Amino acid sequence: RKPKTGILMLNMGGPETLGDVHDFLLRLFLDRDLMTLPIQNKLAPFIAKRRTPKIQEQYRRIGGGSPIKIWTSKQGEGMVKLLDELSPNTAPHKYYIGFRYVHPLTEEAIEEMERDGLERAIAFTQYPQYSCSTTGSSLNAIYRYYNQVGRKPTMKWSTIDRWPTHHLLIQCFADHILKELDHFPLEKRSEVVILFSAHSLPMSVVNRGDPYPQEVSATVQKVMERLEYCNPYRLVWQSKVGPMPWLGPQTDESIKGLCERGRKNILLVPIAFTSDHIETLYELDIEYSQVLAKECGVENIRRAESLNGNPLFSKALADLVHSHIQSNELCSKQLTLSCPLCVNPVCRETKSFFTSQQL
Amino acid sequence: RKPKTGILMLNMGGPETLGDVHDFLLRLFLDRDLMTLPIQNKLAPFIAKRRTPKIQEQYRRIGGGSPIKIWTSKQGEGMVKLLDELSPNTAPHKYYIGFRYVHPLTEEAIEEMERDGLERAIAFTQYPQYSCSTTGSSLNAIYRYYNQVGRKPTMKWSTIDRWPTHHLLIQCFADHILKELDHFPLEKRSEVVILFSAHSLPMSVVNRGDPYPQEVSATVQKVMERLEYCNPYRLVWQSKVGPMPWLGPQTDESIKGLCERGRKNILLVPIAFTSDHIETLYELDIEYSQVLAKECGVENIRRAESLNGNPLFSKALADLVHSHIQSNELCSKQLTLSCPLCVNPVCRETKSFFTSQQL
Numbered sequence A, B: 001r002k003p004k005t006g007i008l009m010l011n012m013g014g015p016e017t018l019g020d021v022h023d024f025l026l027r028l029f030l031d032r033d034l035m036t037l038p039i040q041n042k043l044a045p046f047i048a049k050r051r052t053p054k055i056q057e058q059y060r061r062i063g064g065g066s067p068i069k070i071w072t073s074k075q076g077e078g079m080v081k082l083l084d085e086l087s088p089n090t091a092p093h094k095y096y097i098g099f100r101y102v103h104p105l106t107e108e109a110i111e112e113m114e115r116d117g118l119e120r121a122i123a124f125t126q127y128p129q130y131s132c133s134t135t136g137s138s139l140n141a142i143y144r145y146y147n148q149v150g151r152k153p154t155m156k157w158s159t160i161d162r163w164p165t166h167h168l169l170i171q172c173f174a175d176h177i178l179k180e181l182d183h184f185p186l187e188k189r190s191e192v193v194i195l196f197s198a199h200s201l202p203m204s205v206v207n208r209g210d211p212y213p214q215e216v217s218a219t220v221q222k223v224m225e226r227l228e229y230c231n232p233y234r235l236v237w238q239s240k241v242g243p244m245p246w247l248g249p250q251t252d253e254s255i256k257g258l259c260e261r262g263r264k265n266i267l268l269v270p271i272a273f274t275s276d277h278i279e280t281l282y283e284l285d286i287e288y289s290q291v292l293a294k295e296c297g298v299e300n301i302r303r304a305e306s307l308n309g310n311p312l313f314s315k316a317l318a319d320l321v322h323s324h325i326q327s328n329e330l331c332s333k334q335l336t337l338s339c340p341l342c343v344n345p346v347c348r349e350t351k352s353f354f355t356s357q358q359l
């Protein structure tokens, strides 16, 4: 049967191999929905070229690239299989990968969706917590596409723009934390510090009203409640990319601080990005790890596994889409409110794009 | 029967009359658990005198003082009433008010509790969300009391150091939001923006690892889930003081920004302080209110009522103490972990004070 319902899985994407780093960075620094730079069209290319060496080295340290495409595809296949059983009235379902900075690009995915003659299209962000820099940019890309081709969608659109506390997502995090805790000595498991680490945001973005910090905090609370507060925790942020102020505490400085204060066992939890990504200083630098181990005597620093191919995660995705369909919603109530200090004219347009959709 | 269980209700307190402002500020600027200043013993007095006029004016604008003592007492009476029936085995129960900067002072309350020959003493913070600047300072004051007097406690201590998501607290917030929404025109109720407004924190405190922002965010999520996301919202921060960087967005700037962007109906919610306190610029300054109304055409800016004397809140307090007693816990698991970058040697001492208590 011809595909009836399409699920566009949105994420930033990642360079599959080290050779894909340059174009990844080029598209990233050109994104006006992510950052604003003077003469951006000319400055971005320069920054991308100049920064490619450093980033290639970082990806080499984690295997030689990002596994986001393979993991997203696997999750997409699992999701669709469950959906065909859960929602027979909207079946068959088909998933499409829409990466912001690498192929398949958001634009390429929309193009294919239209060609498949879908009846329903769902913009399903793969970031559980909403940030104008992530989901916002991906959604704006959908609006920009149609406003670029000067044509109106031939499909009925809607969006699942956030899901910071979905029960199955929370169950997955809890399961991975418990599984990792089992790797620490039994006599020390109770002393392990759970350090939830989410990518930071520049303070200029936090102060304009970005929804992300509050939503990430909500995910953390739900996970700790599920874990019955078995261990102490702190939500910290990984930044270390520029000179200006970013939301802290910084993950690196926090690990050092905790160890200097007697906490020798730490469990890092990737609470806001479900795929493997670049790790922190104390996980990749031998010199630093040794300096820390000798000065504070750190004993164990581990990182919980990314949600990757957890079947319960595919179940979470299918559940989200199913509920979305049953609710007949076009977007979350939250998407109808722009940041109090939003200065990006496209945000309002994207909002209207979804709230005004047929049906 | 003579009092058996004492519940020390901890809060910062507030000047009952404009004549109490000076002493209130003096003690506040002298609090090393709140802030550290050069030659603090000398600067504190200077700063207090200099700000007394401004602060007296602020309290005059809201009635001529802080009603925290009256509300805390009413809540304490209601709490005790319920506890005597809920937990006969620990009755009679008696509440004590322990304000950090005004009478009855924390130290004065502990002294009375010991004289009453209590068997059990519970340090019950009245701040639902934990900050080392609020609950932390109040708890440290308890440790400091016994350390300065040079004697060990004659009562068995324990503490309810946080309760950001207690179900009845959440129900109270939801109830007050709904009743205030009813005050908006029927045709606009769906357009109202819920602006949760918590007191801000200096970024130096946020970046050292203070637990507050994440816990406040959790309260917000729980309230919105209870309200079934009926309206859009944002968590903003109010009343920052000084020229240094504080966590934003600022409540004032956010109200102006929202109005400039078309949001003419706003509902402010006191999500992190349970009693009436100093309001924001657009609620008190007629000049700014006018400019805003003429510049963007504000329609309605209302504030949800403080928990004050809501009976459901008294039930919340009793439920918290009851569960605490039944659990036999000495403190939350979170209290056993200091900020990753804590530089106050007393914090660790206070922690051990509670975790090591008899029983």
Ligand code: HEM
Binding pocket: A028, A034, A035, A051, A055, A127, A131, A133, A134, A199, A200, A201, A202, A205, A212, A241, A272, A273, A276, A277, A278, A279
């Ligand atoms: C406006 C705020 C943000 C800015 C300006 C920003 C900027 C950047 C930049 C410039 C890079 C390229 C790498 C480099 O040159 O070092 C990058 C990579 C990345 N960012 Fe962000 N970012 C922001 C928010 C976020 C958020 C909220 C998330 C998470 C959900 C995130 C996740 C990532 C990931 C996963 C990478 C790929 C490399 C890695 O694994 O760290 N970013 N970001």
Ligand code: HEM
Binding pocket: B025, B028, B034, B035, B051, B055, B127, B131, B133, B134, B199, B200, B201, B202, B205, B212, B239, B241, B272, B273, B276, B277, B278, B279
């Ligand atoms: C380390 C961070 C904090 C600092 C430095 C701080 C500082 C101050 C200062 C200096 C004042 C006295 C008035 C003035 O001079 O303007 C004040 C008042 C006050 N603070 Fe804080 N504060 C902090 C955190 C908090 C937090 C987390 C809460 C809330 C739970 C809070 C609630 C209040 C209240 C209720 C008042 C009385 C005025 C009002 O009603 O708004 N403060 N604070």
Ligand SMILES: C[C@H](CCC(=O)O)[C@H]1CC[C@H]2[C@@H]3[C@H](O)C[C@@H]4C[C@H](O)CC[C@]4(C)[C@H]3C[C@H](O)[C@]12C
Binding pocket: A037, A038, A047
């Ligand atoms: C001036 C501009 C910020 C403008 C603004 O905030 O309104 C900032 C943001 C990006 C900065 C540039 C980027 O950081 C890339 C380069 C970094 C080098 O250390 C200085 C030159 C360099 C080319 C920077 C020049 C300048 O400080 C820039 C261009």
Ligand SMILES: C[C@H](CCC(=O)O)[C@H]1CC[C@H]2[C@@H]3[C@H](O)C[C@@H]4C[C@H](O)CC[C@]4(C)[C@H]3C[C@H](O)[C@]12C
Binding pocket: A035, A036, A037, A047, A050, A051, A202, A204, A241, A242, A243, A244
């Ligand atoms: C770190 C990077 C330069 C890397 C390099 O030159 O190798 C620079 C260039 C573009 C800059 C960003 C852009 O200037 C847009 C934002 C400007 C704000 O004032 C700070 C955050 C903000 C998001 C900047 C963060 C950081 O300074 C960036 C990302």
Ligand SMILES: C[C@H](CCC(=O)O)[C@H]1CC[C@H]2[C@@H]3[C@H](O)C[C@@H]4C[C@H](O)CC[C@]4(C)[C@H]3C[C@H](O)[C@]12C
Binding pocket: B037, B038, B043, B047
């Ligand atoms: C230097 C110190 C901050 C030290 C630090 O952050 O490590 C700051 C914080 C409090 C400030 C003081 C307070 O603001 C009170 C006074 C304000 C006057 O405008 C200057 C003198 C004045 C006495 C300030 C001197 C100096 O700027 C102080 C003492």
Ligand SMILES: C[C@H](CCC(=O)O)[C@H]1CC[C@H]2[C@@H]3[C@H](O)C[C@@H]4C[C@H](O)CC[C@]4(C)[C@H]3C[C@H](O)[C@]12C
Binding pocket: B034, B035, B036, B037, B047, B050, B051, B202, B204, B241, B242, B243, B244
């Ligand atoms: C606003 C007040 C000065 C009021 C006045 O001079 O009239 C000043 C004096 C003491 C200052 C505080 C102290 O310097 C201690 C902290 C220093 C950090 O750099 C900012 C937060 C920090 C908590 C400061 C906040 C604010 O700047 C304060 C509270």
Ligand code: FES
Binding pocket: A132, A136, A210, A337, A338, A339, A342, A343, A344, A347, A348
């Ligand atoms: S930047 Fe957040 S809505 Fe535009």
Ligand code: FES
Binding pocket: B132, B136, B210, B337, B338, B339, B342, B343, B344, B347, B348
């Ligand atoms: S300042 Fe937070 S534990 Fe000391």
